[PDB]
Amino acid sequence: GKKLLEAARAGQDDEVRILTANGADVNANDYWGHTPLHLAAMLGHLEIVEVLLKNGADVNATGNTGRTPLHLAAWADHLEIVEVLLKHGADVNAQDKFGKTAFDISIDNGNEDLAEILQK
């Protein structure tokens, strides 16, 4: 049931769609506790994040390190995915074990163009 994880990481879109339809868990979890949505946001696969959203994937799922899919999308400097994820009710003020938001992560990475989206 976790072929969706590798399919989200690999980014083969139609492969993801067919697995989701068969009922595969959209909230499956890797060694770090991250869903297919985390991997798709982090790896910049916008096309799959929407398919997962259509399947109702938790947009604020917490990894074993307490990182939401939004955190990884900001870490990877993927601008459009972040605003997509925010549009689907993302929690900006969520913090990890470290105590960090996506904003803190753009501050560490020096990405103020995306920090504007989080400021905005």
Partner: protein, 211 residues
């Protein structure tokens, strides 16, 4: 005119040396007096180890800076993502490169090795060739072996992995050998380190100069 590259660990470093590393290579073609800084971070936020930094100014006047970060074998095969963020004062915007474990179908390599006939001029030298085909993913390490002794990497040239007309990837390896070498022992082994070769992550093939 600044470039940056981030590589996955070599299969040799990960399986043979048991000490995987990733290297952030920055190549500055025309260097200013500012100092480049390379910073490391993991996607999980768990802590990075202490990296090693190297610096060399080449003859064409360019500067190559590399940072080598030790990674955990567990963390790599379980899919951790690592980023390298490069900041230089005269660079307007930061350059970030990322890396993570390979994906997709997994196929073990097939190895074949051959020896060229005796050219009249090449009486004391022979060329050995190695074909490594039909493997996936594309990451692979090639090694040449003689008298239970690893030959240096400088002694052979290995082509870049190319997609087969059919299925998989294929590389070739060219290695010249001397008469003194095959007269001592006429057995040379071409060995490939590849994740999909189970159970030991190595496939090999031997070849002799003399029929």
């Amino acid at each position: 005119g600044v470039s940056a590259y981030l590589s996955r660990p070599s299969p040799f470093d990960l399986f043979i040396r048991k000490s995987p590393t990733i290297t952030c290579l920055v190549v500055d073609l025309a260097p200013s007096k500012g100092t480049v800084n390379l910073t490391w971070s993991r996607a999980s936020g768990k802590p990075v180890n202490h990296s090693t930094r190297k610096e060399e100014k080449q003859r064409n006047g360019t500067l190559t800076v590399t940072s080598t970060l030790p990674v955990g074998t567990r963390d790599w095969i379980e899919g951790e993502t690592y980023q390298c963020r490069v900041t230089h004062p005269h660079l307007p915007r930061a350059l970030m490169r990322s890396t993570t474990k390979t994906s997709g179908p997994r196929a073990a390599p097939e190895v074949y090795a051959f020896a060229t006939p005796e050219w009249p001029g090449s009486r004391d030298k022979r060329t050995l060739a190695c074909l490594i085909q039909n493997f996936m993913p594309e990451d692979i390490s090639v090694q040449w072996l003689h008298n239970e002794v690893q030959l240096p990497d400088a002694r052979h040239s290995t082509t870049q992995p190319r997609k087969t007309k059919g299925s998989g990837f294929f590389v070739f390896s060219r290695l010249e050998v001397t008469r003194a070498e095959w007269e001592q022992k006429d057995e040379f082994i071409c060995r490939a380190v590849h994740e999909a070769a189970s159970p030991s992550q190595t496939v090999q093939r031997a070849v002799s100069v003399n029929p």
